Amino acid sequence: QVDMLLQEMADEAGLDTGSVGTSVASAEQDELSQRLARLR
Protein backbone atom coordinates (compact mmCIF):
# COMPACT_ATOMS: atom_id res chain seq x y z
CA GLN A 1 0.00 0.00 0.00
CA VAL A 2 2.61 2.55 1.14
CA ASP A 3 4.27 4.62 -1.54
CA MET A 4 7.29 2.57 -2.52
CA LEU A 5 9.55 5.62 -2.17
CA LEU A 6 8.37 6.01 1.40
CA GLN A 7 9.11 2.32 2.01
CA GLU A 8 12.63 3.01 0.82
CA MET A 9 13.25 5.90 3.18
CA ALA A 10 11.73 3.90 6.02
CA ASP A 11 13.85 0.87 5.30
CA GLU A 12 16.89 3.06 4.96
CA ALA A 13 16.50 4.65 8.38
CA GLY A 14 15.23 1.46 10.06
CA LEU A 15 11.65 2.51 10.78
CA ASP A 16 8.07 1.21 10.94
CA THR A 17 4.78 -8.00 -0.96
CA GLY A 18 3.81 -8.29 -4.64
CA SER A 19 5.32 -6.61 -7.68
CA VAL A 20 5.74 -3.39 -5.70
CA GLY A 21 7.74 -5.06 -2.94
CA THR A 22 10.12 -6.29 -5.61
CA SER A 23 10.60 -2.78 -6.98
CA VAL A 24 11.47 -1.70 -3.46
CA ALA A 25 14.06 -4.38 -2.95
CA SER A 26 15.51 -3.90 -6.40
CA ALA A 27 16.06 -0.19 -5.79
CA GLU A 28 17.39 -0.83 -2.30
CA GLN A 29 20.01 -3.25 -3.65
CA ASP A 30 21.11 -0.66 -6.23
CA GLU A 31 21.60 1.73 -3.35
CA LEU A 32 23.68 -0.80 -1.42
CA SER A 33 25.79 -1.28 -4.55
CA GLN A 34 26.35 2.47 -4.96
CA ARG A 35 27.03 2.74 -1.25
CA LEU A 36 29.62 -0.06 -1.14
CA ALA A 37 31.40 1.08 -4.29
CA ARG A 38 31.76 4.52 -2.76
CA LEU A 39 33.74 2.90 0.04
CA ARG A 40 36.61 2.41 -2.37
Partner: protein, 89 residues
Protein backbone atom coordinates in the same frame (compact mmCIF):
# COMPACT_ATOMS: atom_id res chain seq x y z
CA UNK B 1 2.01 -19.33 -8.35
CA UNK B 2 5.12 -20.50 -6.46
CA UNK B 3 5.44 -16.79 -5.70
CA UNK B 4 5.86 -17.60 -2.04
CA UNK B 5 9.36 -18.05 -3.41
CA UNK B 6 9.70 -14.50 -4.69
CA UNK B 7 8.53 -13.39 -1.26
CA UNK B 8 11.02 -15.56 0.56
CA UNK B 9 13.63 -13.61 -1.36
CA UNK B 10 12.17 -10.24 -0.41
CA UNK B 11 12.10 -11.13 3.31
CA UNK B 12 15.77 -12.06 3.15
CA UNK B 13 16.51 -8.83 1.33
CA UNK B 14 14.77 -6.80 4.00
CA UNK B 15 17.15 -8.25 6.58
CA UNK B 16 20.25 -7.98 4.39
CA UNK B 17 19.38 -4.37 3.75
CA UNK B 18 19.02 -3.59 7.46
CA UNK B 19 22.23 -5.26 8.56
CA UNK B 20 24.37 -4.02 5.72
CA UNK B 21 23.07 -0.51 6.05
CA UNK B 22 24.16 -0.52 9.66
CA UNK B 23 27.52 -2.00 8.64
CA UNK B 24 28.03 0.79 6.14
CA UNK B 25 26.95 3.36 8.64
CA UNK B 26 29.44 2.16 11.26
CA UNK B 27 32.11 1.44 8.69
CA UNK B 28 31.65 5.04 7.52
CA UNK B 29 31.99 6.62 10.96
CA UNK B 30 34.79 4.75 12.74
CA UNK B 31 38.25 6.19 12.11
CA UNK B 32 40.57 3.48 10.92
CA UNK B 33 40.95 0.28 12.92
CA UNK B 34 37.94 0.64 15.13
CA UNK B 35 36.22 0.01 11.81
CA UNK B 36 36.06 -3.52 13.18
CA UNK B 37 32.67 -2.85 14.79
CA UNK B 38 31.10 -3.21 11.34
CA UNK B 39 32.33 -6.79 10.98
CA UNK B 40 29.47 -8.33 12.97
CA UNK B 41 27.02 -6.48 10.76
CA UNK B 42 28.55 -7.30 7.38
CA UNK B 43 28.54 -10.90 8.52
CA UNK B 44 24.84 -10.96 9.39
CA UNK B 45 24.14 -9.13 6.15
CA UNK B 46 26.20 -11.49 4.05
CA UNK B 47 24.37 -14.39 5.66
CA UNK B 48 20.97 -12.96 4.71
CA UNK B 49 22.09 -12.29 1.12
CA UNK B 50 23.22 -15.88 0.85
CA UNK B 51 19.86 -17.25 1.98
CA UNK B 52 18.26 -14.91 -0.54
CA UNK B 53 20.41 -16.11 -3.42
CA UNK B 54 19.71 -19.72 -2.49
CA UNK B 55 15.99 -19.47 -3.04
CA UNK B 56 15.13 -21.20 -6.28
CA UNK B 57 12.78 -18.85 -8.04
CA UNK B 58 11.02 -21.04 -10.52
CA UNK B 59 8.41 -19.67 -12.90
CA UNK B 60 7.52 -18.01 -16.19
CA UNK B 61 6.28 -14.62 -15.31
CA UNK B 62 7.62 -11.17 -16.11
CA UNK B 63 7.54 -10.77 -12.34
CA UNK B 64 9.64 -13.91 -11.96
CA UNK B 65 12.43 -12.64 -14.20
CA UNK B 66 12.30 -9.55 -11.99
CA UNK B 67 12.80 -11.59 -8.85
CA UNK B 68 15.76 -13.51 -10.24
CA UNK B 69 17.20 -10.24 -11.46
CA UNK B 70 16.91 -9.20 -7.83
CA UNK B 71 18.82 -12.30 -6.72
CA UNK B 72 21.54 -11.26 -9.16
CA UNK B 73 21.74 -7.87 -7.49
CA UNK B 74 22.12 -9.63 -4.17
CA UNK B 75 24.92 -11.67 -5.69
CA UNK B 76 26.70 -8.45 -6.71
CA UNK B 77 26.46 -7.13 -3.19
CA UNK B 78 27.37 -10.42 -1.52
CA UNK B 79 30.64 -10.16 -3.38
CA UNK B 80 31.39 -6.50 -2.69
CA UNK B 81 30.50 -6.99 0.96
CA UNK B 82 32.72 -10.07 1.40
CA UNK B 83 35.48 -8.02 -0.17
CA UNK B 84 35.02 -5.23 2.32
CA UNK B 85 34.72 -7.70 5.20
CA UNK B 86 37.97 -9.35 4.32
CA UNK B 87 39.64 -5.96 4.20
CA UNK B 88 38.47 -5.28 7.73
CA UNK B 89 39.10 -8.67 9.30
Amino acid sequence: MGSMEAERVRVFHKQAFEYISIALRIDEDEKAGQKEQAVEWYKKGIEELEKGIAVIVTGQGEQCERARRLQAKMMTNLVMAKDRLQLLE
